[PDB]
Ligand binder design. Structure first.
Ligand SMILES: [Mg+2]
Length: 136
């Protein structure tokens, strides 16, 4: 089976993606995106760029992730969807922002749309107040 996989579904991709971030594997995380895949932050500090189109555009902005954040996530609680290519999950992250030393305690609801095991849209909701607390 791991040598004879069908394409990951959206639940599987979200869980795997979070492990990659825990590992600091920014390249592996970006690899999960379709070449035209999109990452969005609906809630973000003002002045930030909040939509990134294309896997390699995402990479251009992700390379140094492990040098900025170490993070651990709780188990994802999924809502049951009609389509396996849509996942909506809630989870919590605890980490340390490296440059400020600030603690990050973040609460997420992620909406992922996928196709053939690749991410088309990662819509990454989180609390911008908590993110600003970590950064300061
Ligand atoms: Mg919008």
């Amino acid at each position: 089976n791991l040598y004879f996989q069908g394409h990951m579904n959206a639940k599987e991709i979200l869980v795997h993606s979070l492990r990659l971030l825990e590992n600091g594997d920014a390249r592996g995380w970006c690899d999960l995106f379709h070449p035209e895949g999109v990452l969005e932050f609906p809630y973000a500090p003002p002045g930030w760029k909040t939509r990134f189109e294309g896997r390699e555009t995402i990479w251009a902005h992700m390379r140094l992730f492990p040098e900025h954040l170490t993070v651990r996530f709780t188990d994802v609680q999924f809502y049951e969807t009609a389509d396996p290519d849509l996942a909506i999950g809630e989870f919590h992250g605890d980490g340390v922002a490296t440059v400020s030393g600030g603690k990050l305690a973040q609460d997420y609801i992620s909406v992922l749309r996928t196709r053939d095991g690749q991410i088309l849209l990662y819509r990454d909701f989180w609390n911008p107040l908590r993110h600003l607390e970590a950064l300061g």
